[PDB]
Design a protein around this ligand. Sequence first.
Ligand SMILES: Nc1ncnc2c1ncn2[C@@H]1O[C@H](CSCC[C@H](N)C(=O)O)[C@@H](O)[C@H]1O
Length: 468
Amino acid sequence: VYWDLDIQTNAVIRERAPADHLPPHPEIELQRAQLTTKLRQHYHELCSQREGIEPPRESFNRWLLERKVVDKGLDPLLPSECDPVISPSMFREIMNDIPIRLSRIKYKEEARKLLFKYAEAAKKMIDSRNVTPESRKVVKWNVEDTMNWLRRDHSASKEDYMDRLENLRKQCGPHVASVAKDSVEGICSKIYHISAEYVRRIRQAHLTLLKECNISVDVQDRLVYCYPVRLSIPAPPQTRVELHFENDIACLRFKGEMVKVSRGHFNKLELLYRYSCIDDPRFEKFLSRVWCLIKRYQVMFGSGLQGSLPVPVFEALNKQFGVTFECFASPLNCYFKQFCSAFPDIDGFFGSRGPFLSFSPASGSFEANPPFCEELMDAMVTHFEDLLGRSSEPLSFIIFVPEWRDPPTPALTRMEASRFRRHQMTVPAFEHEYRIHGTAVIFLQNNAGFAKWEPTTERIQELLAAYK
Ligand SMILES: Nc1ncnc2c1ncn2[C@@H]1O[C@H](CSCC[C@H](N)C(=O)O)[C@@H](O)[C@H]1O
């Protein structure tokens, strides 16, 4: 019992024309998977060759999210037409691991080794790369001072080694950053430009497949309850995808390539497809599409970027505040059968209303638990206030984000200063759901939304009780 697909939407939108996404097919999904693996490999080689580091953990996935905020290109997953070319997300994450990645410390000896490793790497940087005379002498002095300190007889504590590293990094940081800046920007640009080449290859392959199938690739005022994204281009024929179950795991094989999903999630997808798909009355295309869906999300992940909410919390959001819709979800993790998601081309068959920034409700009660991408969260806040100010119909958004204050994300600061904020509180932080400080819960509502779904004391109390 991890979802409630019986709850009907109360989201109201203007009727939309069907979307122009090329309809998914496992042949194309497999190629996109193989090229995205190669792209991650290029990123690994660039980080190693240019800066001697591993790719910062989760940075490639966060890059995909940031790029999609601005991407105007043709692929549902990979970026190809972005201004600016250099991702501020990837740049920021690589620079934080220069000249080395700081790892977790448990023991005094691990702290001493990390401090030495930092000092040694900063020295090799200054010895082997172009650096201004001012920056060179400052780093050289700090490295030499640290090595002299480590040379002393009587040893210090673990906390003293950690404090020495924090101070050393504070002094060297800006100088090391100035040495590596142009190199790091070059990694960000190159991986974007390789992505664009791969996107062109996938696009041509997908166009050629639809032509092989003899498939042609060539109202705003009416308000309706929301409905899944529909594709204007007819879908290609089903392909051969084989299903069998092993130990409650659904195994789907396309041309020898296997993907797996739990039996419970599989049965969920079958139900979402019954509720959401209108072009496949005999389920002939169902296994082809489930294979594409699982593969797409496996590729997106690559096998610390998002968190989920416990079922009793969604029950309380629906019962106390009328929530029927998730602004950020996937067919695999949604609680409601109506939600926005990253991949309209494949997720629409399973209930997706498309990406959130392209979704424009006039009314409804919503929950939002975005992935941890600062750029996406900032666009989300702008989108919230645009929608809340465009409509006088009841409109509410209940938003869950990490309570981070060192420094706070621009999104969290803007939401706390919003003219639509009706309430704010702290609930326990995101934890692993089986299916650091805390979680900020922010209520953004227009006048009509505040009248209909007011966060009264009793309603807030029942929502808090859903954690107890
Ligand atoms: N542009 C976008 N629009 C809507 N959802 C998006 C998105 N980009 C990423 N996502 C999705 O946002 C989700 C955040 S995890 C949220 C889990 C769960 N639905 C909950 O509300 O608690 C992920 O499934 C992620 O793929």
